[PDB]
Amino acid sequence: LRRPQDKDAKGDKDGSLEVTGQLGEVMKESARIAYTFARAFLMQHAPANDYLVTS
Amino acid sequence: LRRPQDKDAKGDKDGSLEVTGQLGEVMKESARIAYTFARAFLMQHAPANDYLVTS
Numbered sequence: 001l002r003r004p005q006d007k008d009a010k011g012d013k014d015g016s017l018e019v020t021g022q023l024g025e026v027m028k029e030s031a032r033i034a035y036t037f038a039r040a041f042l043m044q045h046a047p048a049n050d051y052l053v054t055s
Numbered sequence: 056l057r058r059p060q061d062k063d064a065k066g067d068k069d070g071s072l073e074v075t076g077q078l079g080e081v082m083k084e085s086a087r088i089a090y091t092f093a094r095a096f097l098m099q100h101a102p103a104n105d106y107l108v109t110s
Contacts, residue, residue: 003088 005055015055060110070110 002018005011017035019028042052057073074086094107 003084004091 011054015053056110070107
């Protein structure tokens, strides 16, 4: 985690990823794919959790 | 402080931070982290104090 989620408990802003490690381009799209898919998995499997959505 | 902190002493408005000085995007992260830890440290050391929470 880079920063606590609770700017305010109601925030709908997405838990935007912040890559480090000298990303090129293909690594950016890959991280975004993994990010959205991991979001989908936690959605489908553990709906109650949302920690990946807003942090 | 920008305008008076007595703008509404009853008002629970967040103390907005408005940083200046050609901040890096990471500097904004360090600064918001600074505001948060300042609030945390202030509760750790001077709980009665109320600037950072409401100024």
